[PDB]
Symmetry: D2
Subunit: 268 residues, 4 copies
């Protein structure tokens, strides 16, 4: 019946009901998955948000910079999905970059302490989550992270672009470790979706250029995509993540699937 | 409910029951699709082979070098699936290269007449099929072709490598046309599978060893050249509604080999 | 001492004094190369054009669709440069696509006979020239062809894009053969330059939409290039080809060097 | 010759006479460049080493983690080359990764503090150097860094691979800043060269897996390269960096040139 019937999937990265992770979780539950959710910092807000999902799911705290949270994560997941069950899926939908690393702030003025924090959250944590969770994943399972194509430089995305390049490389190594467990690791490179991070982090760092943000995104994506691109509709991205979590891409690992309307295949 | 429940899908390229297309068709029928099949040249053999599929499907003749076959194709499909119905999917699983263009024959000795024939069948025909079939495809539909990663040169594959590079470029243009109909176009770059065409590339022990080095040894999840199922499933994923934002693109069903250097 | 002092280099593809090959030849002679030139079809015009180069160079006829021309080419080159001498460099600066394959003509309406002719001239001939000339090339030598980045689809370039993809693949195979002779094979992917083919083939196939060419070129190149791009100045492209012909890129083969102002490294 | 006649070029990264930077410096001086050298930590040893170069050059201290060193660098360079003169070239040939991040140590066991240190030295510093030096670079100048192709995962290189992916992304941003000064930024992705850092990837020349290292390098490079690859010969790499420092690749920026015998263009 549903694409993910019977699968136990962890989903990180929900902060609002616009979050990519919110929509991944919604679609996964519509397709019969049983979820465990993780959230950072504003756990009361996150709980109110996840109440809007179609089904209850337990919520665990995870700040990927906190060693204790990572060291206790598998134990807390095992208790949430029922002792002795394992995960079939893990979704990393997590990122951060300080303001100095984005927007109109000059590229060269971001101090390394800020850039390092962003790389820790946005790239290294894909490895740390895999490390914590692989021992409790079933053969045939799937780890998925969110990418935004960093193969070319661009306005404003700045040091987050560098973090995404690092993430891509990390994914290919995670795939080598995950393969010993019969598990796949892949990224979904999504087109732009209107999320809290889009507005507050990228749009914030733009200051008076945020009108231009929309136009840049329409030029980069909707205009180039042969099938178009709607930044207000996260469903196509969520579906693509669900396809990777399913049994229907069983020979794809260390890889990147582009859910961007085909924009990255067209020059203009 | 199967993945392709209710979808009408054309599948080209069956010649034996090892054909990638045979397995694509098998999996698609297991997932509820209704098929129309096309075959080239050995139509009696192909009919015996397609009898082994889990369900009957009509078989139509198509030689992609034949203009008349392409010009009548939509009409013949429409008659097989019923007036008023359209296709949701098309699978291009077709290739050819003359012997001069592959194997131990020197790269520089393949005459252009042979290379041109191979490119016609293996790359241009992806466009010609799209052209013939897009007018009878539903919005939301999907065209999928088969690729073998040509981004780096390699022994023996020779001018077929060039044909695949051409096919990749063709796919990106087909995507622009197909988008006007609400249709996606993508290729699946599969790892090696033991098919009739594989055994024609050369005529052997060295071929298998190179394929093991290039694929199974590099793939984090391994690669089994006797098992077409993972490739077939990947094609079915592209035919489904579960990759709705992917077009002009290439999905690698190769065990992750192409992501690993050694 | 010029960069190519003492080198014997064949340069194909001169048709006017705007031709990329004209500028390659000019720069190569300024850098001390002795040239052999090849031309197609309008040999009287081409001779008047090559008289404007800074030094005399013999001109040979070569239509790359003519088997007899390819089979006699080595012998005719050897007679021009003298028995006992060999070539150090070969430049392929040749292309064609019939009108049905370009512009506003629908992509799907190009018959294969037209596409095949374009692929023959634009891609296969890179192999056929290498095959004819490698037996009279010195170790350390260099074959260079001209590319236009076909990694993504775009308006108007249509089937020429497909021919360039084929050429890239061909270059990697030519490199394998050329390596047995100690010879490198590479392409230069140039940004747009105002040439007869740009205007009459690409621009002509746009009919009343020719303004669209210039607009797309300005968006794709000058606007994205961190150091800018001037389509009226072939010198930077010519210099880059000369760099490949020299001994200063001795470890680069089967490869593509981008002389495009860095445009292809930038998204917008 | 004189490829770099009259150019003032800064070269970082010499520690022994096997260092890639040593050979970059040697070739650059053979081609008429006037050098300023920078060295980290062992400045007396480095001075004995740089005495073996064909000409004297001043040596300045630079630890790229030290803010004071970066803030004073332009002033110290200007004093060495003379007030009123500027640099035409900068070479970044610097890297580091702690032992936990490389070799047989499990990928998942490298702590982020170690990985961050490596990324700081190996990737962020490319930006920090550009920031310090662009204000004293002439139009037409060139910044070059060293890369090792990280587009696919591989044994042992582990987190250094991730650092190189980050460096590639950094280079494309540096190119956007450098373009405002008329300056190019590019990386050279070199094939393997036997240096001190090479041996440290597996914990020393008699590291546990050193036999496996040699075999993997022969398979990855010399066996795939159409023109071969010799890991004892840094000259082809040095020449390629000099090509980028010269005026002969004037339209290439934000980019990567592969000096690896063409290995990366061949599958097997
Ligand atoms: N929105 C886009 O256009 C777009 C496109 C492609 C990729 N992405 C990526 O998708 C992912 C989700 O971002 P989003 O757009 O949905 O935005 P978002 O703001 O909804 O979610 C980002 C999440 O990261 C979490 N996070 C930050 N610091 C963390 C920490 N220390 N520990 C754990 N979690 C932490 C936040 O709590 C939040 O839930 C990210 O990887 C982002 O880069 C976004
Ligand atoms: N087997 C592999 O390892 C592998 C890997 C990647 C991609 N592929 C691709 O998968 C596709 C199917 O190949 P396969 O390996 O299943 O081999 P195969 O021998 O089963 O099938 C090839 C098919 O091409 C058809 N064909 C040839 N000329 C034709 C023409 N003029 N008109 C119509 N059909 C024609 C044949 O009739 C046959 O059905 C091809 O595109 C091939 O290049 C194969
Ligand atoms: N002009 C650009 O913007 C640009 C950019 C990138 C690459 N290129 C490529 O550079 C090369 C040169 O084109 P150009 O722009 O200088 O144009 P051009 O019109 O100056 O030169 C094209 C050349 O192709 C030759 N040619 C065509 N058919 C031939 C045949 N049968 N045999 C031999 N020669 C034949 C013509 O005689 C002519 O000399 C081509 O490969 C073109 O694709 C051009
Ligand atoms: N050797 C190879 O096979 C190879 C191949 C491709 C790329 N590379 C790259 O070439 C570059 C040079 O490495 P190599 O092989 O010549 O090794 P090496 O050990 O000779 O040189 C590395 C240099 O990095 C310097 N360095 C380290 N920490 C520093 C700091 N805090 N501040 C400033 N400098 C610092 C060291 O002092 C040393 O001079 C690196 O970027 C390396 O990754 C090496
Ligand atoms: C979680 C998180 C933390 C830190 C940074 C981002 C982030 O999440 C993302 C949010 C939006 C995007 C998409 N996007 C790009 C841009 C930009 C300016 C416009 C021009 C084109 C580049 N604007 N919108 C990508 C993301 O990774
Ligand atoms: C249909 C068709 C017509 C013409 C040619 C091929 C073909 O179909 C294929 C069959 C098998 C493969 C995979 N493959 C590659 C090789 C080779 C030698 C070994 C090293 C790696 C290159 N051997 N097996 C690829 C195909 O495209
Ligand atoms: C020799 C030859 C034969 C046949 C065709 C071209 C050709 O030579 C070239 C001439 C110009 C270019 C550059 N270019 C591209 C375009 C187009 C519209 C604008 C957007 C980008 C695609 N317009 N200008 C590239 C070439 O290869
Ligand atoms: C400076 C520095 C700091 C930290 C790490 C490296 C480094 O510098 C390099 C030294 C040598 C290489 C080349 N290389 C790779 C490998 C490896 C094992 C063999 C298989 C292929 C991956 N072994 N040799 C690359 C470098 O970046
Ligand atoms: Cl959707």
């Amino acid at each position: 019946t549903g694409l993910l019937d019977g699968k136990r999937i962890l989903v990180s990265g929900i902060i609002t009901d616009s979050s990519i992770a919110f929509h991944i979780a919604r679609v996964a539950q519509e397709q019969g998955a049983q979820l465990v959710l993780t959230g950072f910092d504003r756990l009361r807000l996150i709980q109110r948000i996840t109440d809007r999902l179609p089904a209850k799911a337990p919520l665990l705290e995870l700040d990927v910079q906190n060693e204790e949270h990572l060291a206790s994560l598998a134990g807390r997941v095992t208790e949430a999905i029922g002792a002795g069950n394992k995960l079939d899926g893990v979704v990393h939908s997590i990122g951060f970059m300080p303001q100095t690393g984005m927007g109109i702030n000059p590229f060269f003025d971001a101090p390394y302490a800020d850039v390092s924090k962003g790389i820790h959250i946005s790239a290294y944590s894909y490895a740390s989550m895999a490390k914590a969770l692989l021992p409790i994943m079933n053969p045939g399972g799937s780890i998925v992270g969110m990418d935004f194509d960093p193969s070319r430089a661009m306005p404003a995305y700045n040091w987050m672009t560098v973090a995404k390049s690092a993430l891509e490389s990390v994914n290919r190594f995670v795939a080598r470790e995950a393969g010993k467990y019969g598990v796949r690791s892949n990224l979904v490179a999504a087109g732009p979706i209107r999320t809290l991070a889009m507005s507050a982090i990228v749009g914030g760092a733009l200051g008076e250029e945020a009108g231009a943000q929309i136009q840049l995104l329409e030029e980069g994506w909707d205009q180039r995509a042969p099938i178009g691109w709607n930044m207000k509709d996260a469903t196509p991205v969520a579906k693509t993540v669900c396809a990777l979590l399913s049994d229907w891409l069983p020979a794809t690992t260390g890889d990147i699937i582009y859910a961007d309307g085909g924009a990255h295949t067209q020059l203009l």
